[PDB]
Design a protein around this ligand. Structure first.
Ligand SMILES: Nc1ncnc2c1ncn2[C@@H]1O[C@H](COP(=O)(O)O)[C@@H](O)[C@H]1O
Ligand SMILES: Nc1ncnc2c1ncn2[C@@H]1O[C@H](COP(=O)(O)O)[C@@H](O)[C@H]1O
Lengths: 288, 277
């Protein structure tokens, strides 16, 4: 075990350091909570931190790691926002005791060798045109789960397809961790918080309310059925200046090879200028 | 509740959750959990892994018996052998219990899996590493035991453990051999007398190579080839000298010589440590 100062933020870069500290905490009865992030923290991330915090006896580990493996080449990785000083300041303000900030060399010392191959869900929606993205996510999350060995791991409903795929990972590899989904944090007007929102200029920011407005319109229209819900969403998106829809799909909640019934998830992705935004919402069909 | 466990007796569990719960409970009581993965049909080769696991102070030995459909049966007899060895846990899951959602998330091995045995069987090691990762997470052993017999499998499991940051020690156990050197395998019984006599060439070629190695890598390889060449009906699939991690052989130093061959319809493998010079 390296130094651990309780009630203070401890920052570890070495996998072995955080693994030792986590083990030592776990052996003395603390329950270790893990919150994977790519940094540039905002209130969406803090909702996961707080959910973790409220677990009785919890120690909270927030990982910050802009994982190269889930980026496709073409400057996306270099372009990802990095604000380490603000991130650690926020974690201190939240009472988090552990930040895990690994280097690329420590996570990938052998490059890409053994990796996780996700199931067919990874080839759809976000994965359609980024066929390796979710292998990247599931590989790093598996590694983080093995390094930290948390009792529970926290993921946002914001990245709902990611959340579902993490549940598949946990189920399919018999991982002894509880996956906790945390509801999407929104701005006052409905805009889902994201580190990419900083790339919307004033006009795009105004137009971007249409994604959440479309989804919530759809959620309410859904008493009248799937077609009514989808066409409500399309009408709002269509009314929105310079929103280019990539997809809008209503699926069963597991997003799996199962047709939609009473409970679904409506998912949208759209481009505003160069910024790709995502949102999703629970949908109940024929239910008021 | 935790499932029943009778110390000193063979306790058999088919449900992953059950062996998981028992393993956890035992870990907490001051046992070190040892895992020995098999596909049943046990012989002295498997028993050497068992005995290596047993000798670890405070060990409780978990032997898994599971025929993994993804890398492609004497149940009562296997179980009696384990009882005889003083094994306390056998984990005998069904395919449905191991794969309740079918094949979905899997492990994708690195490029070593496309080589050597990955030649004729390109999907084989994905199946192995997928099932071994699952057994590791179910049982959560302190140490997991594999035979040097399947050396490429062993090296790939070390890669799995390293790459996924798994907290388990991987223990390789030396190949158990018949009196004439042939590596023990359930496949040996398929050989007719001519083929069984010819089959001694694999181990003879490797051991010759090991001793020829004082004269350098080429002398070792040529020695092995000459012994394989003295045997009838032995179709060599490969004969390769690699470093101990199965990368390219270094100029001198330690390596591994691996061989595979087909005798009629039966495919046999063997391998040996080589020290160059
Ligand atoms: N607005 C939000 N509400 C809830 N969770 C979020 C939000 N934005 C990001 N997250 C979650 O925080 C984790 C890290 O997000 P990221 O750093 O963007 O990869 C993921 O589990 C996200 O789903
Ligand atoms: N002759 C042998 N000597 C040492 N280990 C062996 C031998 N035969 C099989 N094993 C090991 O026993 C384990 C189970 O093999 P199997 O049941 O063939 O999957 C593997 O780790 C094998 O490498």
């Amino acid at each position: 075990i390296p130094a651990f100062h309780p009630g203070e933020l401890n920052v570890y870069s070495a996998p072995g350091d955080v693994a030792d500290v986590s083990r030592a905490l776990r052996l003395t009865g603390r329950r270790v909570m893990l919150v994977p992030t790519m940094g540039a923290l905002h209130e969406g991330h803090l909702a996961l931190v707080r959910a973790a915090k409220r677990v009785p006896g919890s120690v909270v580990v927030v990982s910050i790691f802009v994982n190269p493996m889930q980026f496709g080449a073409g400057g996306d990785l270099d372009a990802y926002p990095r604000t380490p000083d603000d991130d650690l300041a926020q974690l201190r303000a939240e009472g988090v005791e552990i930040a895990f900030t690994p280097t690329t060399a420590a996570m990938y010392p052998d490059g890409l060798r053994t990796t996780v191959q996700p199931g067919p869900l990874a080839a759809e929606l976000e994965g359609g045109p980024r066929p390796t993205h979710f292998a990247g996510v599931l590989t790093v999350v598996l590694k983080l789960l093995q390094i930290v060995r948390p009792d529970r791991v926290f993921f946002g409903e914001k990245d709902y397809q990611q959340l579902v795929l993490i549940r598949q990972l946990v189920a399919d590899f018999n991982l002894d961790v509880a996956v906790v989904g945390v509801p999407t944090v929104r701005e006052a007007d409905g805009l889902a918080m994201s580190s990419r929102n900083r790339y919307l200029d004033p006009a795009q920011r105004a137009a971007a309310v249409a994604l959440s407005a479309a989804l919530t319109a759809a959620a309410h229209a859904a008493t009248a059925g799937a077609q009514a819900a989808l066409d409500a969403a399309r009408a709002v998106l269509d009314a929105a200046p310079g929103v280019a829809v990539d997809y809008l799909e209503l699926r069963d909640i597991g997003l799996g090879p199962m047709p939609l019934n009473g409970s679904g998830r409506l998912l949208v992705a759209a481009r505003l200028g160069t910024t790709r935004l995502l949102d999703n919402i629970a949908i109940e069909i024929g239910t008021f």
